[PDB]
Design a protein around this ligand. Structure first.
Ligand SMILES: Nc1ncnc2c1ncn2[C@@H]1O[C@H](COP(=O)(O)OP(=O)(O)OP(=O)(O)O)[C@@H](O)[C@H]1O
Lengths: 836, 143, 158
């Protein structure tokens, strides 16, 4: 029964019984100490890293042995714990032990009741102290004086002193033996505290133990870290060598053996002082609580709020999980407990100050923003790691811009550009693994109760990581210089809007050297800005004025222009994502919606990067305003996470790779109609690009959004369709019949997906005119596919005649892009035809 | 004591339990062989012979510390996981060599991925690629 | 009383015997801060000198450190430590980029020589330069307020 009170001081002095994390060790260490006395050096060691609780543990051992003095048949007297770091710099350890031992003996002398017994043993104790007084200079002398030789020959000490040389080891041995007679004990327990604060002071502790504490009347227990002691011991064996030999024999044939010899000296010095059978390792909290379901060694509970009794306590594994399940917005699974496991492996001092700063500010706030409470805790707890990892430290700048900068630098050091934006605590380093959860609380805080900011991390945070990996890294010191240009060009950490970043991202996908000159880049199509002869079919220069109100507005945002050697209009999907992020930030006023719609298309002058060598409009704002009001009414209960944002981008980014090359060659002369799946004209490339993002937000958010407790996509294969819609259709079909089984809505389960499928800008891209496949089975799946979207959205997107006109090859459309398919993509000369 | 087939210079026996009679004390090679074979899960072959021989080549202090820690822990536990108990004994003595290599010296970090990192660090340090993963003591360095 | 405390300015080590003389409050001047505060003793010394001289403030003037710019560290330290009173006005002359070079060298002396040699990687060295540059730009800001700085003009400007 270990009940940790988080609102207690929780300090080594204030730690009592029933809240000691180490209790099996304390029980078994005392028995081992006692048995070694019932039957040379008798030295025990308690190992553990910094903050493992050595001082807390070893004080309990002294308390355990001190209690029931006379009752135990084997008698052990414990001196007060010696802390080498708090001792005076030049004060010897043998002086500290004797000074504490003298007071213990002196208080026992004052406790006698017989005058002659007290009088006789007082002079014997004083006689040994005088002998030690005479010989202490042997420790603190810089040279030998011939006057000492006559003192060494003085054999009138009146004691045994089997060897006569003024041996401080023998003087202390008789002093300890006399002290045991006065104190009436079988042995005296010398206790040493950990030296982690300053391990330089631990050499005198180690030297004193072997030189002076060899008596069988002495038992020694020492705490610390063996790897910290090893570098201390090994650093002294290097001082035994003659320096002149070190430079002269600098050859790798002798330097290897010299390093080998020091290892042999270090290996035996540690074995000489601390026998292996006497060692004890302080078990980490993870090693004491067990795993997911397997029973742990001990059962440990914690108190999260003041004023409760012991029956209201919860296990430490649960309490840390609830701080991560709510703080990081993670549901129960293999990705939430890995954060708990990573925190359990942390030092206990670091773990307490996480569970204290969290719940102290949580009970004083609830009497919210749980992600904000944990982030504050992990900011100071991991603070030293943050400075080491070179992140942003200013709390008055904890904004969207800083978070996206941290992601790029976190993966710049994590050496993981593929999946390193999940902020997973999986790195081999300790600082980067510590910042993996501090940054994962940054994402769960900034992107909480919002939609504009969630896409900002998705597009700028995770996006800039991926765009660098596949399009800029091939040019690379250069790599640090290249990042100095990539971050500066893409303005990571100082973006104005997601579309402004997109207007630069779309250039980067084109700036990289790509072969075959085809304009079907990754996530974008390079629509031809001019025309010439030999244009087959209904193919011409791209026109913006051809589209109606909403269709013009949607594609106006999607358009991007690069100021290369020749200006190149680019239509992409990041611009649609960028525009949605900008619009979702705008409020309900109609005077600002037009600003987010017009800042994206005009005044765009994106120069090539240095590393590159070369009124229907009002009928749409009423839909945008209705959707914007639909955003703010559901976006409050949106609880995404760094994993979910990265996972959504992972599925999204793989589709863009698939669409870019699977549709690169499928362009032929008769592709304008797009009746068959073989034809993949520019209106089908972007139809699936939007459906790629809607699917990434469909499956991934159905797996990890914390608002849903049971899975909805179900058992099956998730292939994120390209050139097809059937598997995208079926997953929406499964959830529809699944939400009906338990009578649950389409808004609380998928708040994140619902507000994107209902986005007015994305609607004209779902069903273009050069889009929908027109085979008998294609219309069979797409007839329900369009119906399913209308059902979940709540209103019809296309009327009965609108769908019939698209399936069967004029009526103008404002909610459907028309001229896109007629446009031709740069570098795609349609000299062939679609095979049958 | 020879090499399991030689009439060695001396006959050393080990008392592996409290109160064992000197007459009923098993051979020193057998006592080490019991720990290696039942701890590393080996049969009677040259694989176990080279491990026990290498433990004989260790210093007497290191040999006894492994012997003492292993059997003292074993007796208390019996009142099993012999590999775990041997892992406790092998850890303390073969601890300074861990740092010289770069192994996993944290018990809380006893993760299966760490062993993959440990062995890869081991085989990289062993500088043998086609045979390093055998985890054989074929190296010329005591670490 | 100022002579009694001058040893603190020149001592190479602390003398535990002086603690007995750092505890006496026998002075009738009644210094509010604890005993042996040279920054305070000079304050009442200047305040007493203003009454005798019958003046509102005393102007301490320092020449430039062109011929030996290491000598200007004591000037900088004395201004902030001692010459901070409403009765004292300080005017200093000299190249500002020479005082900055002098302060920068002192901020590097607060770093342990072992850390400088043992951490030569660019990520740590660059951060050290940013800290030193930030440390010595605030030192000049506190010592020499910008609104009180005056720049001598050359013939081309005049
Ligand atoms: N048994 C325990 N119960 C509650 N909290 C504990 C316990 N053991 C350790 N802690 C917490 O972990 C911290 C670790 O401090 P402790 O002094 O015990 O470890 P140490 O780093 O080995 O020692 P030192 O302070 O001498 O370097 C404690 O301050 C306390 O907050």
């Amino acid at each position: 029964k270990i009940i940790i009170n988080l609102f207690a001081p929780n300090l080594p002095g204030s730690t009592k019984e029933d809240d000691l994390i180490q209790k099996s060790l304390r029980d078994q260490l005392v028995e081992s100490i006692r048995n070694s006395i019932a039957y040379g050096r008798n030295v025990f060691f308690v190992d553990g890293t910094r903050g493992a609780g050595k001082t807390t543990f070893i004080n309990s051992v002294v308390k355990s042995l001190n209690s029931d003095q006379d009752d135990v048949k084997v008698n052990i007297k414990c001196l007060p714990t010696i802390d080498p770091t708090k001792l005076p710099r030049h004060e010897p350890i043998l002086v500290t032990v004797t000074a504490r031992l003298n007071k213990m003996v002196s208080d026992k002398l004052k406790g006698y009741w017989a005058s002659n017994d007290y009088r006789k043993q007082k002079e014997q104790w004083q006689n040994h102290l005088a002998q030690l007084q005479r010989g202490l200079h042997l420790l603190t002398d810089k040279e030998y004086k011939p006057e000492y030789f006559s003192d060494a020959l003085k054999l009138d000490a009146q004691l045994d002193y089997s060897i006569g040389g003024q041996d401080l080891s023998e003087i202390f041995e008789e002093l300890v033996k006399r002290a045991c007679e006065i104190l009436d004990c079988k042995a005296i327990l010398i206790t040493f505290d950990d030296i982690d604060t300053q391990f330089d002071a631990g050499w005198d502790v180690l030297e004193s133990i072997r030189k002076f504490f060899n008596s069988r009347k002495l038992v020694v227990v020492a705490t610390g870290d063996l790897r910290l002691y090893s570098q201390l011991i090994r650093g002294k064996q290097y001082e035994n060598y003659s320096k002149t030999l070190l430079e002269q024999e600098k050859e790798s044939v002798r330097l290897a053996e010299r390093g080998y010899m020091v290892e042999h000296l270090e290996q035996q010095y540690l074995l000489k002082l601390f026998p292996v059978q006497k060692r004890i390792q302080l078990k980490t909290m993870l090693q004491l609580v067990g795993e997911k379901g397997k029973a742990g060694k001990e059962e440990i509970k914690v108190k999260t709020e003041p004023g409760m009794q012991d029956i209201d306590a919860i296990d430490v594994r649960q309490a840390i999980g609830d701080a991560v399940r709510e703080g990081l917005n993670l549901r129960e699974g293999s990705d939430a407990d890995m954060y708990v496991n990573e925190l359990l492996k942390q030092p206990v001092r670091l773990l307490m100050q996480v569970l204290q700063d969290f719940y102290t500010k949580k009970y004083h706030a609830t009497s919210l923003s749980v992600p904000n409470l944990l982030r504050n805790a992990l900011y100071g707890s991991m603070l030293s790691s943050i400075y080491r990892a070179g992140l942003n430290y200013e709390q008055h700048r904890f904004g969207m811009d800083s978070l996206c900068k941290d992601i790029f630098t976190y993966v710049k050091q994590d050496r993981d550009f593929n999946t390193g934006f999940y902020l997973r605590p999986q790195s081999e380093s300790e600082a980067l693994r510590n910042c993996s959860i501090y940054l994962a609380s940054q994402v769960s805080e900034n992107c909480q109760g919002s939609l504009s900011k969630f896409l900002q991390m998705l597009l700028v945070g995770c996006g800039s990581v991926s765009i660098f990996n596949q399009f800029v890294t091939e040019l690379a010191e250069k790599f640090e210089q290249l990042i100095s240009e990539y971050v500066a060009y893409m303005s990571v950490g100082r973006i104005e809007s997601a579309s402004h970043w997109a207007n630069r991202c779309c250039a980067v996908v084109a700036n990289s050297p790509n072969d075959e000159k085809i304009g079907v880049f990754l996530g974008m199509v390079q629509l031809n800005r001019k025309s010439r002869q030999h244009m087959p079919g209904g193919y011409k220069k791209f026109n913006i004025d051809t589209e109606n109100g909403l269709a013009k507005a949607a594609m106006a945002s999607s358009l991007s222009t690069v100021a290369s050697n020749n200006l190149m209009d680019f239509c992409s999907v990041f611009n649609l994502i960028g525009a949605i992020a900008d619009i979702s930030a705008c409020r309900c006023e109609r005077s600002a919606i037009t600003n987010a719609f017009n800042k994206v298309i005009a005044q765009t002058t994106c120069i090539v990067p240095p590393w590159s060598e070369a009124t229907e409009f009002s009928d749409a704002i009423t839909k945008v305003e209705q959707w914007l009001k639909n955003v703010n009414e559901i976006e409050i209960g949106i609880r995404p996470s760094a994993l979910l944002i990265g996972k959504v981008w992972s599925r999204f980014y793989f589709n863009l790779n698939n669409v870019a090359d699977q549709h690169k060659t499928r362009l032929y002369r008769n592709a304008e109609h797009g009746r068959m799946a073989s034809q993949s004209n520019a209106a089908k490339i972007m139809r699936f690009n939007v459906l790629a993002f809607l699917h990434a937000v469909l499956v991934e958010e159905s797996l990890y959004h914390s608002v849903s407790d049971r899975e909805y996509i179900g058992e099956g294969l998730r292939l994120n369709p390209v050139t097809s819609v059937d598997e995208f259709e079926k997953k929406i079909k499964i959830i529809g019949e699944k939400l009906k089984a338990d009578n649950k809505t389409w808004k609380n389960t998928h708040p994140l997906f619902f507000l994107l499928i209902s986005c007015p800008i994305l609607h004209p891209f779902i069903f273009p005119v050069g889009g929908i496949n027109c085979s008998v089975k294609a219309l069979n799946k797409e007839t329900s596919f369009n119906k399913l979207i209308d059902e979940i959205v709540g209103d019809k997107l296309l009327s009965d005649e609108e769908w019939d006109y698209l399936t069967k090859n004029q009526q103008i459309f404002q909610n459907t892009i028309t001229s896109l398919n007629s446009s031709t993509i740069v570098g795609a000369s349609y000299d062939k035809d679609t095979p049958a």
